[PDB]
Design a protein around this ligand. Structure first.
Ligand code: NA
Ligand code: NA
Ligand code: NA
Length: 162
């Protein structure tokens, strides 16, 4: 198990534009296109992201390219953020993947706002961090995925993904 396989489990793979859990146009492996309600706006984002006229359908290789870029962007965003980088640096490799997963789903700014959870993770108070992470819109709206990510932070194992 690794961050790519973990996110593939959590995000799935679809090759045509569809709406994510928040109702936002998405493609591939959880590649958010736009929060706009305009499908045309989402298709333009897709064409710009892929570099060709797509009219809403991509290949698996194209989906995997966006996914690679998106995982890279999540790590890059953690490392450039003054609140996330110290937490990331303090974690082991499994829990680092759990933090990348959150940033992939919610964005750098969203995760960096979890001030109290981040402090408990930096303190390595894993059960307390897990309880605190569940007191969130994130957990309430995607509880099964959040439970998997939280179990990864709690245990430092891949038990929730195997
Ligand atoms: Na708490
Ligand atoms: Na869920
Ligand atoms: Na589990």
């Amino acid at each position: 198990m690794n961050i790519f396989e973990m996110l593939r489990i959590d995000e799935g793979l679809r090759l045509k534009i569809y709406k994510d859990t928040e109702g936002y146009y998405t493609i591939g492996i959880g590649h958010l296109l736009t929060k706009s309600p305009s499908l045309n706006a989402a298709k333009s984002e897709l064409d710009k992201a892929i570099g060709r006229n797509t009219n809403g359908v991509i290949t698996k290789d194209e989906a995997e390219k966006l996914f690679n870029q998106d995982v890279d962007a999540a790590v890059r965003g953690i490392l450039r953020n003054a609140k996330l980088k110290p937490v990331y640096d303090s974690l082991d490799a499994v829990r680092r993947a759990a933090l990348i997963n959150m940033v992939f789903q919610m964005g750098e700014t969203g995760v960096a706002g979890f001030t109290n959870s981040l402090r408990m993770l930096q303190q390595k108070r894993w059960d307390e961090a897990a309880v605190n992470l569940a007191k969130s819109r994130w957990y309430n709206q995607t509880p099964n995925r959040a439970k998997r990510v939280i179990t990864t932070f709690r245990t430092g194992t891949w038990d929730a993904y195997k």
